């Protein structure tokens, strides 16, 4: 899976261990081995949410399977919890787009997963 | 909705009030309340369009509904208009990707919109 | 088409002409004229792949058609090859998301391709 967070919080406010924490927590949540999980955090962004620029985050989670109505509701709680505690972002200022991808449309290691 | 603009134009050329202009204009265009609109502007990017590094922009608008043939033409006119007027980017050097998302695939505040 | 590469490799490690090579090679691979290829390279990112912060990349290729099983394998070989040779990123630390988009959902020049 691939998890991306874009945020206006400054780089200094993103803990050094945040990417590893996200990796491990997403591995548990998706049931995928952590070696497969990629994480990308983009701080210092020029953003607004609801016309205001208090801390906020725009995220996406991409996976081959393990995406669906109930699962996504559960991922939102996991990810809002982490963003709230580690980045101090209110959960009502977080959007997460979920993508359930076909293996044929995910490239890796000179090929695709298909 | 969520609107993202990636451009090679320098930060200094992004007018103050641009995020608010995008928020309000998108509210009127989509008919969605401004409190749900998220906007993200990323200047100073390393990009090319047609091989040329003259000003360009790569955008994306994500929405639950309010996306379609007719609506997208209207959004493109509005958004290229703003990028031309405010950022001095030629409309033929702008791409906008439109995403009509299922409510179940959009996380917000510890749940999804489904 | 639109190709985006996000990487933790430093900017100084992206060779001069990389955006031109991507434009040219993607035009050849997709069969699309190079005038309509947009490329976006984002170095110096805060990223992890499998919990390691060694060089990695997360990419996407969006196209109206020219996306499918066999084609995507070919694009992945091409693109992972370039990331390995030019940016020194191991192919097993690259993900590429492929998106086959409807013309009605791609804005350009004040309109859409629909
Ligand atoms: C199950 C595995 O061995 C590898 C994973 O399936 C890769 C994966 N789920 C994956 C990686 C990047 C993506 O962007 C994505 F949508 C899915
Ligand atoms: C008025 C509402 O019910 C909330 C909005 O409809 C949410 C929305 N359309 C929305 C927000 C962020 C997204 O990334 C997205 F794809 C859709
Ligand atoms: C006449 C053409 O060949 C136009 C191209 O098909 C544009 C194209 N495939 C394209 C451009 C930007 C995009 O973001 C995208 F998803 C697709
Ligand atoms: Cl720390
Ligand atoms: Cl589910
Ligand atoms: Cl897919
Ligand atoms: Cl969706
Ligand atoms: Cl194919
Ligand atoms: Cl589409």
Author numbering:
A (entry chain A), B (entry chain C), C (entry chain B): 1 to 114
Text of the article:
We have identified ISO-66, a novel analog of ISO-1, as a potent inhibitor of MIF tautomerase activity.
This finding was also supported by structural studies, in which MIF was co-crystallized with KF III 53Y. ISO-66 was found bound in the MIF tautomerase active sites, with the meta-fluoro-para-hydroxyphenyl ring buried in the innermost part of the cleft, as expected. What was unexpected, however, was that the five-membered ring of the inhibitor had been opened. The bond between the nitrogen and oxygen was cleaved, resulting in free imine and hydroxyl groups. An open ring structure was seen in all three active sites. Lys 32 donates a strong hydrogen bond to the hydroxyl generated by the ring-opening reaction. The nitrogen that was formerly of the five-membered ring accepts a hydrogen bond from the main chain amide of Ile 64. In active site A, however, there was excess electron density around the methylene and terminal methyl ketone group of the inhibitor. It is very interesting that this excess density can be explained by the intact, ring-closed form of the inhibitor, having partial occupancy.
